[PDB]
Amino acid sequence: QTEAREELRANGYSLLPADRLVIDAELRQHVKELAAEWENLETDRFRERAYDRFFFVPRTGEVRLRPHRPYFQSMNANDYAGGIDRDVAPLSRTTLANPLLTRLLRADFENFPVPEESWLDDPWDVQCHQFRIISTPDPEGPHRDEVDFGVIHLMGRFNAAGGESQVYSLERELVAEFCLTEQMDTMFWSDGQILHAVRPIHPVDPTKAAVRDVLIMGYKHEPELRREEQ
Amino acid sequence: TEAREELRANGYSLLPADRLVIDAELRQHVKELAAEWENLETDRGSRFRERAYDRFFFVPRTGEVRLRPHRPYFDVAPLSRTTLANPLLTRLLRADFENFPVPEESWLDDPWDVQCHQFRIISTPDEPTPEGPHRDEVDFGVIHLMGRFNAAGGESQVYSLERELVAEFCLTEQMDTMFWSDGQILHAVRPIHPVDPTKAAVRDVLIMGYKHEPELRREE
Ligand SMILES: [K+]
Ligand SMILES: [K+]
């Protein structure tokens, strides 16, 4: 955690490959259960996704699932309430039941350099995205997520090349590029300090699809967010 | 794998372009990259050299690659903007490294310093003593042939640490590649000279040298 905070301070991002301790037996099992959820995402070159937001208090570890704000309400109010301006299904029942989801939400936060101690007692909105990227046999530029801190975990990579992650300065110069390749390979970043992007994926075996599964969480300090019905 | 043990046993391995599988995206980016050699700045008679150069911070486990501040003394120019923007450069950087027989798996978690050189050799009518064997003072090297035009000679040479010639081969096709263990052999390349004596002989080459540097820090 402490090298990570300093890496985020200095460089705006920090990497955590799974190769430093990926699993005891019970953890490994919860990883497998979680990653399997990416096979059951609502289908829409091709991107399948699910989404939810959490009320989160770092001091207590309190995590509450915020009500899934309907798209028709956001659009017609022209107010997406800080969340995404897209229409996405909620996280599955078995995603939410998986204790690894709450564990990762709490544990990832400890890698971020929180600039004011008082923020640990405030609510944070935590946006949680399951993304499956698909390139079938047949790119967004540098950006921010409009949060304070982000984390990405690779759930899976299937017949995929490319997909390199790119870190840019606020001035849109490439300063770093890395590769999440193993399951649970992880990156943390300070979202107001860098911009980022990901290269397209392409199949290694071109007769088959290439698939990249990631879990992205974005943490935004929100001192005025109050508890909602759950 | 084969290149590893070939490097482990003999200190160098060849990878001809034909032994490689090339799709169309790779095909497209190779042409974009090789064309960069047409816009290099001169000075590194009978022999001319145009070049460009930069260094990267590299961690193999994560694939992290960071361009390091351009130091003007390896005045060599930096790699061009379109060179650095070509995804093939860092993809070769990472892929080439996988061929090296790293002695300790833990070195995969350390920083490496990677030098990346764009070399163009131009040769006009001969009136030129070839170089003796030598190191590059790295742990592992790779050379990729980008282009060879109207050129005879230019053979790559592998020597023993005793400075005796053990092997000689010639990179001739685009993306012909040589890997080597730099503390293990010495190497050299012979001069090129024009075939058609009324045109320049040109040999274009991408060289990367990898040096394990556990104490290298990230630079901002
Ligand atoms: K768990
Ligand atoms: K020459």
Short mmCIF file of C-alpha atoms and ligand atoms in Angstrom, two decimals:
data_model
loop_
_atom_site.label_atom_id
_atom_site.label_comp_id
_atom_site.label_asym_id
_atom_site.label_seq_id
_atom_site.Cartn_x
_atom_site.Cartn_y
_atom_site.Cartn_z
CA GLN A 1 0.00 0.00 0.00
CA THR A 2 2.69 2.48 1.03
CA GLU A 3 4.86 2.18 -2.09
CA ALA A 4 1.62 2.41 -4.10
CA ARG A 5 0.50 5.66 -2.46
CA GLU A 6 3.92 7.11 -3.17
CA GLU A 7 3.89 5.86 -6.75
CA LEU A 8 0.47 7.46 -7.23
CA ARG A 9 1.79 10.70 -5.72
CA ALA A 10 4.92 10.70 -7.88
CA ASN A 11 3.74 9.17 -11.17
CA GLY A 12 -0.06 9.15 -11.02
CA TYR A 13 -0.33 5.33 -11.27
CA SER A 14 0.95 2.13 -9.66
CA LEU A 15 0.94 -1.46 -10.90
CA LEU A 16 0.27 -4.63 -8.90
CA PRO A 17 0.81 -7.87 -10.83
CA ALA A 18 -0.93 -10.95 -9.50
CA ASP A 19 2.47 -12.69 -9.34
CA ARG A 20 2.90 -11.40 -5.77
CA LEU A 21 0.44 -13.74 -4.05
CA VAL A 22 -2.71 -14.38 -6.09
CA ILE A 23 -4.45 -17.01 -4.03
CA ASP A 24 -4.88 -19.23 -1.09
CA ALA A 25 -7.62 -21.79 -1.77
CA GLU A 26 -10.62 -19.74 -0.64
CA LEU A 27 -9.44 -16.55 -2.33
CA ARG A 28 -8.71 -18.40 -5.58
CA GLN A 29 -12.24 -19.79 -5.52
CA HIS A 30 -13.82 -16.36 -5.07
CA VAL A 31 -11.65 -15.02 -7.91
CA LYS A 32 -12.94 -17.79 -10.17
CA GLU A 33 -16.56 -17.14 -9.17
CA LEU A 34 -16.16 -13.41 -9.77
CA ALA A 35 -14.42 -13.73 -13.15
CA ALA A 36 -17.07 -16.21 -14.32
CA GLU A 37 -19.65 -13.41 -14.08
CA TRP A 38 -18.19 -11.86 -17.22
CA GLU A 39 -19.73 -14.75 -19.23
CA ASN A 40 -23.23 -13.57 -18.22
CA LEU A 41 -23.17 -9.85 -19.06
CA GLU A 42 -26.01 -8.17 -20.96
CA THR A 43 -25.02 -8.19 -24.62
CA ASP A 44 -24.97 -5.04 -26.76
CA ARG A 45 -16.78 -3.73 -32.01
CA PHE A 46 -18.48 -5.35 -29.04
CA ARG A 47 -18.68 -4.42 -25.35
CA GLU A 48 -20.72 -6.19 -22.68
CA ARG A 49 -21.14 -4.42 -19.37
CA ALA A 50 -22.78 -4.17 -15.98
CA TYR A 51 -22.63 -1.32 -13.48
CA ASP A 52 -23.55 -0.24 -9.98
CA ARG A 53 -22.56 2.48 -7.53
CA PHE A 54 -21.73 2.14 -3.85
CA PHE A 55 -21.87 4.40 -0.84
CA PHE A 56 -18.55 3.83 0.93
CA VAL A 57 -17.11 5.12 4.21
CA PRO A 58 -13.44 4.16 4.52
CA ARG A 59 -13.22 4.60 8.31
CA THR A 60 -15.98 2.08 9.03
CA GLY A 61 -15.68 0.00 5.86
CA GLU A 62 -19.41 0.60 5.34
CA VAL A 63 -20.45 -0.31 1.80
CA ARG A 64 -24.01 0.27 0.66
CA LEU A 65 -25.36 -0.53 -2.81
CA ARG A 66 -26.90 2.66 -4.13
CA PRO A 67 -30.22 2.34 -5.98
CA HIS A 68 -29.72 1.73 -9.69
CA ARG A 69 -30.63 5.14 -11.07
CA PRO A 70 -32.83 4.51 -14.14
CA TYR A 71 -31.56 5.83 -17.45
CA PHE A 72 -34.95 7.32 -18.37
CA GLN A 73 -34.77 9.39 -15.19
CA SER A 74 -31.27 10.72 -15.81
CA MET A 75 -31.91 11.56 -19.47
CA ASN A 76 -35.30 13.22 -18.92
CA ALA A 77 -33.85 15.16 -15.96
CA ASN A 78 -30.71 15.96 -18.02
CA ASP A 79 -28.85 14.99 -14.84
CA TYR A 80 -26.80 11.80 -14.66
CA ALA A 81 -26.06 12.43 -10.95
CA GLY A 82 -22.30 12.10 -11.43
CA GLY A 83 -22.70 8.58 -12.85
CA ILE A 84 -22.23 7.43 -16.42
CA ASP A 85 -24.44 8.79 -19.21
CA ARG A 86 -25.15 5.29 -20.56
CA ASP A 87 -27.83 2.66 -20.00
CA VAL A 88 -26.28 -0.40 -18.33
CA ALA A 89 -27.66 -3.42 -16.48
CA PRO A 90 -26.95 -3.84 -12.75
CA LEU A 91 -24.37 -6.19 -11.32
CA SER A 92 -25.67 -9.74 -11.06
CA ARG A 93 -26.94 -11.21 -7.82
CA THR A 94 -23.94 -13.54 -7.66
CA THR A 95 -21.48 -10.68 -8.30
CA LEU A 96 -22.90 -8.80 -5.30
CA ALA A 97 -23.04 -11.92 -3.12
CA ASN A 98 -19.35 -12.59 -3.78
CA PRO A 99 -17.43 -11.35 -0.70
CA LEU A 100 -14.41 -10.70 -2.91
CA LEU A 101 -16.28 -7.75 -4.47
CA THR A 102 -16.59 -5.95 -1.12
CA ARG A 103 -13.09 -7.04 -0.11
CA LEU A 104 -11.56 -5.54 -3.26
CA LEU A 105 -13.60 -2.35 -2.91
CA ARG A 106 -12.20 -1.82 0.61
CA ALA A 107 -8.66 -3.10 0.00
CA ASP A 108 -8.08 -1.17 -3.23
CA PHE A 109 -8.85 2.12 -1.45
CA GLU A 110 -5.81 1.66 0.81
CA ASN A 111 -3.47 2.23 -2.15
CA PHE A 112 -4.65 5.76 -2.75
CA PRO A 113 -2.89 8.83 -1.29
CA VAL A 114 -5.84 10.44 0.48
CA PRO A 115 -4.84 14.12 0.71
CA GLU A 116 -6.94 15.02 3.80
CA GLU A 117 -7.43 12.65 6.75
CA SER A 118 -10.96 13.97 7.29
CA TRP A 119 -11.99 12.31 4.00
CA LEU A 120 -11.81 8.87 5.62
CA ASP A 121 -14.94 9.83 7.62
CA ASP A 122 -16.83 11.16 4.60
CA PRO A 123 -18.88 9.13 2.13
CA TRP A 124 -17.31 8.17 -1.18
CA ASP A 125 -19.21 7.22 -4.30
CA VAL A 126 -17.61 4.09 -5.82
CA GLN A 127 -18.61 3.31 -9.39
CA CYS A 128 -18.15 -0.35 -10.22
CA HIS A 129 -17.95 -1.51 -13.85
CA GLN A 130 -17.72 -5.01 -15.26
CA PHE A 131 -16.45 -4.63 -18.87
CA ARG A 132 -16.05 -7.43 -21.41
CA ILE A 133 -14.27 -6.24 -24.56
CA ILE A 134 -14.81 -8.42 -27.63
CA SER A 135 -13.04 -8.41 -31.01
CA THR A 136 -14.73 -10.87 -33.38
CA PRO A 137 -13.16 -12.43 -36.50
CA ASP A 138 -14.27 -10.14 -39.29
CA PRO A 139 -10.12 3.57 -30.10
CA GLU A 140 -10.85 6.11 -27.37
CA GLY A 141 -8.14 8.70 -26.84
CA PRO A 142 -6.63 9.81 -23.54
CA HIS A 143 -9.33 10.60 -21.00
CA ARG A 144 -10.21 10.63 -17.32
CA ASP A 145 -13.09 8.93 -15.51
CA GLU A 146 -14.04 12.11 -13.58
CA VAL A 147 -13.34 10.57 -10.18
CA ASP A 148 -10.57 10.93 -7.62
CA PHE A 149 -8.96 7.49 -7.78
CA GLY A 150 -9.38 4.47 -10.03
CA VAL A 151 -8.51 0.77 -10.00
CA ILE A 152 -8.61 -1.82 -12.75
CA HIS A 153 -8.27 -5.57 -12.28
CA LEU A 154 -7.86 -7.98 -15.20
CA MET A 155 -10.41 -10.74 -14.76
CA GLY A 156 -9.45 -12.56 -17.91
CA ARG A 157 -7.80 -12.44 -21.29
CA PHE A 158 -8.73 -14.92 -24.03
CA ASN A 159 -6.95 -15.20 -27.41
CA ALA A 160 -6.09 -11.52 -27.07
CA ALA A 161 -3.13 -9.45 -28.17
CA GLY A 162 -2.88 -5.71 -27.85
CA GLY A 163 -4.91 -4.11 -25.12
CA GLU A 164 -1.88 -2.29 -23.71
CA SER A 165 -2.79 0.31 -21.07
CA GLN A 166 -1.50 3.82 -21.66
CA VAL A 167 -0.83 6.65 -19.20
CA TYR A 168 -0.71 10.24 -20.47
CA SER A 169 0.17 13.59 -18.93
CA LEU A 170 -2.51 16.27 -18.62
CA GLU A 171 -0.82 17.62 -21.74
CA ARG A 172 -1.52 14.33 -23.60
CA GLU A 173 2.07 13.11 -23.86
CA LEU A 174 2.49 9.35 -23.43
CA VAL A 175 4.53 8.78 -20.26
CA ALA A 176 3.93 5.07 -19.65
CA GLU A 177 2.41 1.93 -21.17
CA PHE A 178 1.98 -1.45 -19.50
CA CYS A 179 0.18 -4.77 -20.04
CA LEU A 180 -2.29 -6.42 -17.73
CA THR A 181 -1.80 -10.02 -18.72
CA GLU A 182 -2.50 -12.38 -15.79
CA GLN A 183 -5.74 -12.76 -13.92
CA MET A 184 -5.91 -10.18 -11.08
CA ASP A 185 -3.11 -8.06 -12.55
CA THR A 186 -4.01 -4.62 -11.24
CA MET A 187 -3.41 -0.92 -11.84
CA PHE A 188 -4.24 2.00 -9.51
CA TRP A 189 -4.31 5.62 -10.67
CA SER A 190 -4.96 9.19 -9.52
CA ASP A 191 -7.68 10.31 -11.89
CA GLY A 192 -7.04 14.06 -11.75
CA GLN A 193 -3.31 13.69 -12.21
CA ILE A 194 -3.03 11.65 -15.45
CA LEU A 195 -5.09 10.72 -18.46
CA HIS A 196 -5.34 7.15 -19.63
CA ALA A 197 -6.43 4.95 -22.51
CA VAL A 198 -6.32 1.33 -23.63
CA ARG A 199 -5.26 0.06 -27.04
CA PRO A 200 -7.67 -2.12 -29.05
CA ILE A 201 -7.36 -5.87 -28.64
CA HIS A 202 -6.98 -8.20 -31.58
CA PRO A 203 -7.11 -11.99 -31.77
CA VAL A 204 -3.97 -14.07 -31.67
CA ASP A 205 -5.82 -16.86 -33.46
CA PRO A 206 -7.70 -14.78 -36.05
CA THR A 207 -10.35 -17.47 -36.60
CA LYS A 208 -11.62 -16.89 -33.02
CA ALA A 209 -12.81 -13.95 -30.97
CA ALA A 210 -10.48 -12.00 -28.71
CA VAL A 211 -11.94 -11.23 -25.27
CA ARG A 212 -10.67 -8.97 -22.45
CA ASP A 213 -12.50 -8.90 -19.09
CA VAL A 214 -11.86 -6.12 -16.56
CA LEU A 215 -13.36 -4.82 -13.32
CA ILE A 216 -12.98 -1.05 -13.02
CA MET A 217 -13.80 0.92 -9.89
CA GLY A 218 -13.77 4.68 -9.62
CA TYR A 219 -13.73 6.37 -6.20
CA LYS A 220 -15.06 9.92 -5.80
CA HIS A 221 -15.01 11.84 -2.51
CA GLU A 222 -18.59 13.07 -1.85
CA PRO A 223 -18.95 14.73 1.59
CA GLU A 224 -22.65 15.50 1.04
CA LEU A 225 -23.84 12.12 -0.23
CA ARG A 226 -26.33 10.67 2.24
CA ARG A 227 -27.48 7.10 2.73
CA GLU A 228 -30.23 5.89 0.40
CA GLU A 229 -32.69 3.01 0.54
CA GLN A 230 -31.13 -0.42 0.03
CA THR B 1 11.65 -22.47 -26.07
CA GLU B 2 14.11 -22.76 -28.97
CA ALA B 3 15.56 -19.23 -29.09
CA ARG B 4 16.14 -19.32 -25.32
CA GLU B 5 18.18 -22.52 -25.36
CA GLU B 6 19.89 -21.46 -28.59
CA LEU B 7 20.86 -18.30 -26.74
CA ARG B 8 21.67 -20.33 -23.64
CA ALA B 9 23.86 -22.77 -25.57
CA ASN B 10 25.47 -20.58 -28.25
CA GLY B 11 25.02 -16.95 -27.16
CA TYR B 12 23.04 -15.92 -30.24
CA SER B 13 19.97 -17.07 -32.12
CA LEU B 14 18.64 -16.28 -35.58
CA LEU B 15 14.99 -15.62 -36.38
CA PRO B 16 14.49 -15.16 -40.12
CA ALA B 17 11.42 -13.22 -41.18
CA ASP B 18 9.95 -16.37 -42.75
CA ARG B 19 9.95 -18.35 -39.47
CA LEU B 20 7.64 -15.63 -38.11
CA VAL B 21 3.87 -15.36 -38.62
CA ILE B 22 2.93 -11.94 -39.99
CA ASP B 23 -0.69 -10.78 -40.18
CA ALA B 24 -1.81 -7.52 -41.82
CA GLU B 25 -1.81 -5.20 -38.79
CA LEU B 26 1.78 -6.25 -38.12
CA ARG B 27 2.44 -5.93 -41.87
CA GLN B 28 1.01 -2.41 -41.82
CA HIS B 29 2.97 -1.25 -38.77
CA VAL B 30 6.27 -2.69 -40.03
CA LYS B 31 5.99 -0.53 -43.15
CA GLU B 32 5.12 2.55 -41.08
CA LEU B 33 8.12 1.86 -38.80
CA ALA B 34 10.63 1.07 -41.55
CA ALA B 35 9.71 4.26 -43.43
CA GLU B 36 10.98 6.20 -40.38
CA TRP B 37 14.52 5.38 -41.45
CA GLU B 38 14.02 7.77 -44.41
CA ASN B 39 13.92 10.80 -42.07
CA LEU B 40 16.92 10.29 -39.80
CA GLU B 41 19.54 12.97 -39.23
CA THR B 42 23.09 12.50 -40.48
CA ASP B 43 26.38 12.04 -38.59
CA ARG B 44 26.42 9.26 -35.97
CA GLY B 45 33.74 10.12 -47.20
CA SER B 46 32.77 6.58 -48.33
CA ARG B 47 30.53 5.69 -45.38
CA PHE B 48 27.69 7.67 -43.80
CA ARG B 49 25.50 6.99 -40.76
CA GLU B 50 22.13 8.51 -39.83
CA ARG B 51 20.67 7.63 -36.46
CA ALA B 52 18.17 8.28 -33.70
CA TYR B 53 18.01 7.07 -30.16
CA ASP B 54 16.12 6.90 -26.88
CA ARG B 55 16.06 4.87 -23.68
CA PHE B 56 13.19 3.22 -21.83
CA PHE B 57 12.48 2.14 -18.29
CA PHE B 58 11.15 -1.43 -18.60
CA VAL B 59 9.72 -3.87 -16.05
CA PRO B 60 9.11 -7.28 -17.69
CA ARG B 61 6.49 -8.65 -15.29
CA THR B 62 4.03 -5.81 -15.85
CA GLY B 63 5.27 -4.79 -19.28
CA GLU B 64 5.72 -1.26 -17.94
CA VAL B 65 7.60 0.86 -20.51
CA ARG B 66 8.42 4.54 -19.86
CA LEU B 67 10.36 6.72 -22.27
CA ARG B 68 13.26 8.24 -20.33
CA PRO B 69 14.43 11.86 -20.72
CA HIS B 70 16.40 12.13 -23.93
CA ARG B 71 20.04 12.54 -23.07
CA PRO B 72 21.89 14.25 -25.95
CA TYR B 73 24.99 12.02 -25.57
CA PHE B 74 24.65 8.24 -25.92
CA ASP B 75 24.26 14.93 -30.48
CA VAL B 76 22.02 12.00 -31.46
CA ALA B 77 18.43 12.95 -32.18
CA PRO B 78 15.48 11.37 -30.36
CA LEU B 79 13.24 8.79 -31.94
CA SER B 80 10.72 10.53 -34.15
CA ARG B 81 7.20 11.30 -33.02
CA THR B 82 5.68 8.77 -35.43
CA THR B 83 8.24 6.15 -34.36
CA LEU B 84 7.18 6.50 -30.72
CA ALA B 85 3.51 6.56 -31.77
CA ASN B 86 3.85 3.25 -33.65
CA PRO B 87 2.60 0.41 -31.39
CA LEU B 88 5.07 -1.99 -32.99
CA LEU B 89 8.09 -0.47 -31.25
CA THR B 90 7.14 -1.33 -27.68
CA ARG B 91 5.53 -4.59 -28.81
CA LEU B 92 8.88 -5.67 -30.23
CA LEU B 93 10.57 -4.39 -27.08
CA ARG B 94 8.41 -6.70 -24.92
CA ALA B 95 8.33 -9.65 -27.31
CA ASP B 96 12.07 -9.65 -27.98
CA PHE B 97 12.78 -9.78 -24.26
CA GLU B 98 10.87 -13.07 -23.95
CA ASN B 99 13.62 -14.78 -25.97
CA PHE B 100 16.37 -14.07 -23.44
CA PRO B 101 17.37 -16.66 -20.82
CA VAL B 102 17.10 -14.43 -17.76
CA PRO B 103 19.23 -16.02 -15.00
CA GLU B 104 16.92 -15.15 -12.08
CA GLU B 105 13.13 -15.03 -12.40
CA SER B 106 13.17 -12.24 -9.84
CA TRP B 107 14.91 -9.99 -12.37
CA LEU B 108 11.52 -9.98 -14.13
CA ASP B 109 10.33 -7.77 -11.25
CA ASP B 110 13.19 -5.28 -11.56
CA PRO B 111 13.67 -2.28 -13.83
CA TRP B 112 15.68 -2.78 -17.01
CA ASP B 113 17.28 -0.05 -19.08
CA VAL B 114 16.51 -0.56 -22.76
CA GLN B 115 18.38 1.41 -25.41
CA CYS B 116 16.58 1.72 -28.73
CA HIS B 117 18.65 2.76 -31.78
CA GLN B 118 17.51 3.54 -35.32
CA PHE B 119 20.62 3.06 -37.50
CA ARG B 120 20.92 3.76 -41.22
CA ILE B 121 24.23 2.95 -42.92
CA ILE B 122 24.81 4.58 -46.33
CA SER B 123 27.71 3.42 -48.50
CA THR B 124 28.94 4.90 -51.78
CA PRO B 125 31.75 3.77 -54.21
CA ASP B 126 34.63 2.20 -52.30
CA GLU B 127 38.23 3.40 -52.30
CA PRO B 128 37.53 0.57 -45.31
CA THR B 129 38.89 -1.90 -42.75
CA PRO B 130 36.16 -3.99 -41.09
CA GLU B 131 35.66 -3.70 -37.35
CA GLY B 132 37.03 -6.15 -34.83
CA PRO B 133 34.85 -8.04 -32.37
CA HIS B 134 33.30 -6.10 -29.51
CA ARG B 135 30.54 -5.94 -26.87
CA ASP B 136 27.74 -3.44 -26.42
CA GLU B 137 27.94 -3.50 -22.59
CA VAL B 138 24.38 -4.73 -22.02
CA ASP B 139 22.99 -8.05 -20.94
CA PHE B 140 20.97 -8.90 -24.06
CA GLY B 141 20.72 -7.48 -27.55
CA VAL B 142 18.41 -7.77 -30.52
CA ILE B 143 18.83 -6.41 -34.04
CA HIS B 144 15.96 -6.19 -36.52
CA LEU B 145 16.71 -5.64 -40.21
CA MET B 146 14.36 -2.90 -41.39
CA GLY B 147 15.67 -2.56 -44.91
CA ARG B 148 18.58 -3.36 -47.20
CA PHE B 149 18.98 -1.56 -50.53
CA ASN B 150 21.58 -2.15 -53.25
CA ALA B 151 23.88 -3.62 -50.59
CA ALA B 152 26.52 -6.32 -50.74
CA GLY B 153 28.40 -7.38 -47.64
CA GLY B 154 27.15 -6.40 -44.21
CA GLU B 155 27.35 -9.89 -42.75
CA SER B 156 26.80 -10.27 -39.04
CA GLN B 157 29.65 -12.00 -37.22
CA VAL B 158 29.66 -13.90 -33.92
CA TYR B 159 33.00 -14.35 -32.14
CA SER B 160 34.07 -16.27 -29.07
CA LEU B 161 35.32 -14.37 -26.05
CA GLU B 162 38.73 -15.44 -27.41
CA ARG B 163 38.03 -13.22 -30.47
CA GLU B 164 37.86 -16.20 -32.84
CA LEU B 165 35.11 -16.19 -35.48
CA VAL B 166 32.51 -18.89 -34.81
CA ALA B 167 29.65 -17.92 -37.12
CA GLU B 168 28.74 -15.51 -39.89
CA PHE B 169 25.28 -14.88 -41.36
CA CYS B 170 23.55 -12.13 -43.27
CA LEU B 171 20.32 -10.37 -42.38
CA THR B 172 18.69 -9.73 -45.76
CA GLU B 173 14.89 -9.78 -45.44
CA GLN B 174 12.80 -7.15 -43.65
CA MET B 175 12.41 -8.21 -39.97
CA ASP B 176 15.28 -10.71 -40.10
CA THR B 177 16.34 -10.75 -36.47
CA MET B 178 19.37 -11.67 -34.37
CA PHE B 179 19.26 -12.10 -30.58
CA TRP B 180 22.41 -12.33 -28.51
CA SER B 181 23.74 -12.59 -24.96
CA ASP B 182 26.18 -9.70 -24.73
CA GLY B 183 28.33 -10.94 -21.86
CA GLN B 184 28.65 -14.27 -23.67
CA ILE B 185 29.91 -13.52 -27.21
CA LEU B 186 31.53 -10.75 -29.15
CA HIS B 187 30.01 -9.57 -32.39
CA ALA B 188 30.61 -7.35 -35.40
CA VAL B 189 29.12 -6.45 -38.77
CA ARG B 190 31.01 -6.17 -42.01
CA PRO B 191 30.93 -3.07 -44.23
CA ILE B 192 28.35 -2.77 -46.97
CA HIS B 193 29.19 -1.60 -50.48
CA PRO B 194 27.03 -0.78 -53.51
CA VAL B 195 25.95 -3.54 -55.88
CA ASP B 196 25.04 -1.12 -58.67
CA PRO B 197 28.12 1.07 -58.19
CA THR B 198 26.15 4.12 -59.34
CA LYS B 199 23.67 4.04 -56.44
CA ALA B 200 24.02 4.24 -52.69
CA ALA B 201 24.09 1.08 -50.62
CA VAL B 202 21.74 1.45 -47.63
CA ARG B 203 21.25 -0.87 -44.62
CA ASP B 204 18.61 0.04 -42.02
CA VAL B 205 18.56 -1.56 -38.61
CA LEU B 206 16.65 -1.39 -35.31
CA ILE B 207 18.85 -2.25 -32.31
CA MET B 208 17.73 -2.67 -28.70
CA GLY B 209 20.01 -3.32 -25.77
CA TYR B 210 18.60 -4.52 -22.44
CA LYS B 211 20.50 -4.02 -19.17
CA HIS B 212 19.16 -5.23 -15.81
CA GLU B 213 19.22 -2.22 -13.42
CA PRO B 214 17.59 -3.05 -10.07
CA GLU B 215 18.21 0.48 -8.76
CA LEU B 216 16.83 2.40 -11.75
CA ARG B 217 14.09 4.78 -10.64
CA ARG B 218 11.20 6.27 -12.57
CA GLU B 219 11.88 9.76 -13.93
CA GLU B 220 9.25 12.48 -14.25
K K C 1 -12.62 -13.01 -0.44
K K C 2 29.33 -0.48 -44.48
#
